[PDB]
């Protein structure tokens, strides 16, 4: 009411939106929040900061790290073999081993590795070894095998 009214003397936008009373109700919510604590994380969140258009455009950085990635490995570590516990069909001669990537080595011929990049929660029927990607191809051919 003090300096803020002086701020209202400018271009009268701040508050570029037509809404204004909602901010006052939010102030009442703040006075209600004075009795709170814990927690500070609940402060602006009670007003839902940056939720007005988070669903909209934006871009956002937010680094993805670190051990969270390991958890994903465990997911695959559980997931792939389950798909193999199900379907499968077939394609032997293979030797499945779910460690980070689904391994598929050969004898004289070559090794291959696999990992899906779509979705995880869809096995069983209509989950017959569907999504996959080649991860590398380090062939073990006895005559040539340097693999540039």
């Amino acid at each position: 009411f003090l300096q803020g009214q002086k701020f209202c003397f400018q271009n009268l936008v701040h508050v570029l939106q037509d809404i204004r009373y909602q901010l006052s109700f939010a102030r009442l919510r703040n006075s209600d929040l004075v009795t709170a604590l814990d927690i500070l994380s609940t402060g602006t969140s009670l007003r839902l900061a940056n939720a007005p258009t988070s669903k909209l455009y934006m871009l956002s950085e937010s680094p993805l790290s670190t051990k969270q990635i390991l958890q994903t490995l465990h997911a695959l570590n559980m997931l792939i073999r389950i798909r193999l516990s199900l379907y499968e069909i077939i394609p032997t001669p293979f030797q499945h081993f779910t460690i980070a990537n689904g391994r598929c080595t050969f004898t004289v011929p070559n090794e291959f590795s696999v990992s899906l990049t779509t979705n995880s929660q869809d096995p069983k029927s209509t989950g017959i070894s569907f999504q996959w990607i080649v991860v590398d191809f380090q062939f073990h051919l006895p005559d040539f095998s340097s693999t540039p």
């Binding site: 709170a36 993805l64 790290s65 990635i69 590795s113 779509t118 991860v135």
Partner: protein, 93 residues
Amino acid sequence: DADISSLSLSLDPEIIGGQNNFLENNLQQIFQKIIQERGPFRDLKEEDLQKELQKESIKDESSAKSSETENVLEFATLDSKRNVNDTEVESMD
């Protein structure tokens, strides 16, 4: 009460409630930082296991370094930010 700290998740319950798992959400994120695709990542599994050890061992053993605080330290990033413009990334295709 402390439960209010979780209320944002309740606020999330009214919305998208976190995108969570997705192809890009793990893989495209993996393209950032470590490593070079899942190929480097595969051998980076055990390296990540070692990273959990001694790299995480340094829980606390240093000066408070409060002199850098606070908004000034926030202003310190501006050098790297202005330096970031020089990247001119990337492929010409």
